[PDB]
Coordinates of all heavy atoms in Angstrom, one line a residue:
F139 N 112.1 87.4 98.6 CA 112.3 88.1 99.9 C 111.2 87.8 100.9 O 110.0 87.8 100.5 CB 112.5 89.5 99.6 CG 112.7 90.4 100.9 CD1 113.9 90.1 101.7 CD2 111.8 91.3 101.3 CE1 114.1 90.9 102.8 CE2 112.1 92.1 102.4 CZ 113.2 91.8 103.2
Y140 N 111.6 87.6 102.1 CA 110.6 87.3 103.2 C 110.7 88.4 104.3 O 111.6 88.5 105.1 CB 111.0 85.9 103.9 CG 111.1 84.8 102.8 CD1 112.3 84.3 102.4 CD2 109.9 84.4 102.3 CE1 112.3 83.2 101.5 CE2 109.9 83.3 101.3 CZ 111.1 82.8 100.9 OH 111.1 81.8 100.0
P141 N 109.7 89.4 104.2 CA 109.7 90.6 105.0 C 109.7 90.4 106.5 O 110.1 91.3 107.2 CB 108.5 91.3 104.6 CG 108.2 90.9 103.2 CD 108.7 89.5 103.1
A142 N 109.1 89.3 107.0 CA 109.0 89.1 108.4 C 110.0 88.1 108.9 O 110.1 87.8 110.0 CB 107.6 88.5 108.7
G143 N 110.8 87.6 107.9 CA 111.9 86.7 108.3 C 111.6 85.6 109.2 O 110.8 84.7 108.8
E144 N 112.2 85.5 110.3 CA 112.2 84.3 111.2 C 110.8 84.2 111.9 O 110.4 83.1 112.2 CB 113.3 84.4 112.2 CG 113.3 85.5 113.2 CD 114.2 85.3 114.3 OE1 115.3 84.7 114.2 OE2 113.8 85.8 115.5
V145 N 110.2 85.3 112.1 CA 108.8 85.4 112.6 C 107.9 84.3 112.0 O 107.1 83.7 112.7 CB 108.2 86.8 112.4 CG1 106.7 86.8 112.7 CG2 108.8 87.8 113.2
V146 N 108.0 84.1 110.6 CA 107.1 83.2 109.9 C 107.9 82.1 109.1 O 107.3 81.5 108.2 CB 106.2 84.0 109.0 CG1 104.9 83.2 108.8 CG2 105.9 85.3 109.6
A147 N 109.1 81.9 109.4 CA 109.9 81.0 108.6 C 109.4 79.6 108.5 O 109.4 79.0 107.4 CB 111.4 81.0 109.1
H148 N 109.0 79.1 109.6 CA 108.5 77.7 109.6 C 107.2 77.5 108.8 O 107.2 76.6 108.0 CB 108.2 77.3 111.0 CG 109.5 77.2 111.8 ND1 109.7 77.8 113.1 CD2 110.7 76.6 111.5 CE1 110.9 77.5 113.5 NE2 111.5 76.8 112.6
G151 N 108.4 78.8 104.9 CA 109.4 78.0 104.2 C 110.2 78.9 103.3 O 110.3 80.2 103.5
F152 N 110.8 78.3 102.3 CA 111.6 79.1 101.3 C 111.8 78.3 100.0 O 111.5 77.1 99.9 CB 112.9 79.5 101.9 CG 113.8 78.3 102.3 CD1 114.7 77.7 101.3 CD2 113.9 77.8 103.6 CE1 115.5 76.6 101.7 CE2 114.7 76.8 103.9 CZ 115.5 76.2 103.0
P251 N 113.6 76.5 118.2 CA 114.3 77.6 117.5 C 113.8 77.9 116.2 O 113.1 77.1 115.6 CB 115.7 77.0 117.5 CG 115.6 75.5 117.5 CD 114.3 75.3 118.3
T252 N 114.2 79.0 115.6 CA 113.8 79.4 114.3 C 115.0 79.9 113.5 O 116.2 79.8 113.9 CB 112.7 80.5 114.3 OG1 112.3 80.8 113.0 CG2 113.1 81.7 115.0
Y253 N 114.8 80.4 112.3 CA 115.9 80.8 111.4 C 115.4 82.0 110.5 O 114.2 82.2 110.3 CB 116.5 79.7 110.6 CG 115.4 79.2 109.5 CD1 115.5 79.5 108.2 CD2 114.4 78.4 109.9 CE1 114.6 79.1 107.3 CE2 113.5 77.9 109.0 CZ 113.6 78.3 107.7 OH 112.6 77.8 106.8
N254 N 116.4 82.7 110.0 CA 116.2 83.7 109.1 C 116.3 83.1 107.6 O 117.3 82.8 107.1 CB 117.3 84.8 109.2 CG 117.0 86.0 108.3 OD1 115.9 86.2 107.9 ND2 118.1 86.8 108.1
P255 N 115.1 83.0 107.0 CA 115.1 82.5 105.6 C 115.8 83.4 104.6 O 116.2 82.9 103.5 CB 113.6 82.4 105.3 CG 113.0 83.5 106.0 CD 113.8 83.6 107.3
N256 N 115.9 84.7 104.9 CA 116.6 85.6 104.0 C 118.1 85.5 104.1 O 118.8 86.0 103.2 CB 116.3 87.0 104.4 CG 114.8 87.4 104.1 OD1 114.3 87.1 103.0 ND2 114.2 88.1 105.0
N257 N 118.6 84.8 105.1 CA 120.0 84.5 105.2 C 120.3 83.2 105.9 O 120.3 83.1 107.1 CB 120.7 85.6 106.0 CG 122.2 85.6 105.8 OD1 122.9 84.6 106.2 ND2 122.7 86.7 105.3
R258 N 120.6 82.1 105.1 CA 120.7 80.8 105.6 C 122.1 80.3 105.7 O 122.4 79.1 105.6 CB 119.8 79.9 104.7 CG 118.5 80.5 104.5 CD 117.5 79.4 103.9 NE 117.8 79.2 102.5 CZ 117.2 79.9 101.4 NH1 116.3 80.8 101.7 NH2 117.5 79.5 100.2
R259 N 123.0 81.3 105.8 CA 124.5 81.0 105.8 C 124.9 79.9 106.7 O 125.4 78.9 106.3 CB 125.2 82.4 106.1 CG 126.6 82.3 106.7 CD 127.6 81.8 105.6 NE 128.8 81.2 106.3 CZ 129.8 82.0 106.9 NH1 129.7 83.3 106.9 NH2 130.8 81.3 107.5
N260 N 124.6 80.1 108.0 CA 125.0 79.1 109.0 C 123.8 78.4 109.6 O 123.7 78.2 110.8 CB 125.8 79.8 110.1 CG 127.2 80.2 109.7 OD1 128.0 79.3 109.3 ND2 127.5 81.5 109.8
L261 N 122.9 78.0 108.7 CA 121.7 77.3 109.1 C 121.9 75.9 109.6 O 122.7 75.2 109.0 CB 120.7 77.3 107.9 CG 119.3 76.8 108.2 CD1 118.7 77.4 109.4 CD2 118.4 77.1 106.9
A265 N 116.9 74.0 113.5 CA 116.1 75.3 113.5 C 115.0 75.4 112.4 O 114.2 76.3 112.5 CB 117.1 76.5 113.4
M266 N 115.1 74.5 111.5 CA 114.2 74.6 110.3 C 112.8 74.0 110.6 O 111.9 74.2 109.8 CB 114.8 74.0 109.1 CG 116.0 74.7 108.6 SD 116.9 73.7 107.3 CE 115.7 73.7 106.0

Side-chain angles (χ1 to χ4, degrees):
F139 179 63
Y140 305 108
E144 63 165 32
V145 171
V146 210
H148 293 130
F152 63 86
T252 184
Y253 65 105
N254 187 21
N256 292 318
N257 197 297
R258 313 192 283 269
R259 158 67 203 284
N260 287 301
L261 187 44
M266 291 168 71

